[PDB]
Symmetry: C2
Subunit: 156 residues, 2 copies
């Protein structure tokens, strides 16, 4: 019941964290207001708990403008250490599997990750929302096509 | 835009530990164990450099999913390669679905702005790249307000 496998290459991932971040109001709202003003395409956003970093992906072509905008928006917090230094990881890619609806993603998730793990492809981040039946994984850009191939063999 | 939706009575599991960065296949093991248990995983997020994984299940599946995790990771938990499983109950997932353009630019900003204005704490976020939709995990107590205020902003 798989729809398709998609890949977006040449992405960069930002990760914002800090000891204060659990205690600060509207941190995601500020991050994404800053990206919106800078006209930056935020393709993936993930935060696994209030204590862990907010991570988000942008196309590599937007990476320098996004970093400058993040440094501007969080200047005070960074200088004071409420936020740890911004983490920027370049040369990434996003592989996604699209279901045909929600129900059958159970076997699909297990199979998707099993294929990547068999290929020894490191997963840098994961995002699956509750509305679309689709799972996105962030990998190193050099692994993108191999990741599509092994996922395709497993699922089709 | 296309809609604002709500799932109540969710539980969120978080799997964390030194072994998450450097052991092969940890997400594969988590989701094989959920699959063997016939437990639908409605949300997944992994965001930190320490590679902790969080995922949500319906509250009715919480006891069986906890047992499946304890069985799959029995040896890593005993060795301390994984820290004790974290389990948060009484959660809701609010999702916004947009149209076909990269509209989440204005959408994701305003959605998070509406929740912050309402003083609604965010428990987890997941937005994949293939859908124009964004899901946010909140306390179940805040779900009805969170939806009302995100309707007000984005409509």
């Amino acid at each position: 019941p798989v729809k398709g496998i998609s890949n977006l290459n040449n992405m960069a991932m930002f990760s914002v964290s800090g000891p204060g971040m659990k205690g600060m109001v509207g941190m995601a709202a500020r991050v994404f207001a800053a990206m919106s003003r800078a006209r930056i395409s935020v393709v993936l956003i993930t935060q696994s708990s209030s204590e862990y970093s907010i991570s988000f992906c942008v196309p590599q072509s937007d990476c320098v403008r996004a970093e400058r905008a993040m440094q501007e928006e969080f200047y005070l917090e960074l200088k004071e250490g409420l936020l740890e230094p911004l983490a920027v990881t370049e040369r990434l890619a996003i592989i996604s599997v699209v279901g045909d609806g929600m129900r059958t993603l159970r076997g699909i998730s297990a199979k998707f990750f099993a294929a990547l793990a068999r290929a020894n492809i490191n997963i840098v981040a994961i995002a699956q929302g509750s509305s679309e039946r689709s799972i996105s994984v962030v990998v190193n850009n050099d692994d993108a096509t191999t990741g599509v191939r092994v996922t395709h063999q497993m699922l089709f």
